Amino acid sequence: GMVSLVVPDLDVLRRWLDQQSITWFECDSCQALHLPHMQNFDGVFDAKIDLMDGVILFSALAEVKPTALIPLAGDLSQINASSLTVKAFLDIQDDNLPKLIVCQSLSAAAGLTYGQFVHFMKESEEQISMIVMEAFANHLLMIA
Amino acid sequence: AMGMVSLVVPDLDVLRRWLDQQSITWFECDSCQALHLPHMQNFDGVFDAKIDLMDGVILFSALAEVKPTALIPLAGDLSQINASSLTVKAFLDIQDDNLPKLIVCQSLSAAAGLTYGQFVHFMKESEEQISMIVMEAFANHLLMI
């Protein structure tokens, strides 16, 4: 049948997460909707929903072992090639543990439907969790 | 808030039609199911671009050939290239028989349905983001002719 096509803002996303019974919290310092259930996957210290220039991003963050940083940076092509949708890259700071970011995007500027968002939440959770769990099994990550 | 639509799950024929409606030329390899996109070869570096449909996901990918001397440096900048776009991915495909390739790509998840307008948005945003990545790598002398 027919469905509403909507250009969403963060309130739309929050309501759509409630409609899925997916729990979210906020950071006071940050603009994302954080997803506590993703910390049930080993290696995940945070996961979140951002909205940035009309694109939705679901990302998960893992802390990387300093000794695995170089082998991981050398695995990035194969990790990115392993998923049709998910992408993985490193975020390295001078003040902190290096981070693996594993993320999927959904472009929202031409409108989305609720069902498209639901599918996104499920496909992303699956594809993201797979990469991060694999990295955890390969002894690359710190326990959260 | 732009109204009611009816979504379609496209197959490859749907995508052919949708590319026809945007007057985007495509053609078919003897040896893939990808819809190749000649117009992408007008961006320096790009030796091939195509659309694939696989397991309910559309992929718009461009391929460029990387100079052997730029391979390690490019391997080192992948995180930054992937962090620089909200939607495009980039990775290396290296064979013993050929030159290394840089693969720059964007996906559109199709299995829950799409409107034609979403697909159009995808082609325009993919082209823009892919070309930006490939052009910058060309400018930085990482690619072959």
10 Å CB burial of residue B95 (0-12, 13-18, 19+) is exposed
The Cα–Cα gap between B115 and B104 comes to 24
B145 three-class SS: coil
Residue A65 DSSP one-character state: P
How far apart CA B55 and CA A69 sit, in angstroms, is 32
Residues A47, A53, A58, CA angle at the centre, nearest 5°?
20
Strands B27-28 and B35-36: antiparallel
Query: How many separate helices (H) and strands (E) can be counted in chain A?
Result: 3, 7
For A114, the closest chain B residue by CA position comes to B112
Contacts with A55 from chain B: Cβ below 8 Å: 86-87
Beta-carbon separation of B91 and A85 below 8 A? no
Dihedral over alpha carbons B66, B69, B71, B76 (to 10 degrees)? -130
C-beta atoms of A80 and B87 within 8 A: no
Pairs across A and B, CB distance < 8 A: 109
Domain extents in chain A: 1-144
Contact criterion met (CB < 8 Å) for B87 and A73: no
Tokens of B45: 């570096």
Distance CA B86, CA B97 (A): 33
| Rounded Cα gap, residues B72 and A84, in angstroms | 24
Instruction: Give the span between the Cα atoms of A121 and A135, in whole angstroms.
Output: 21
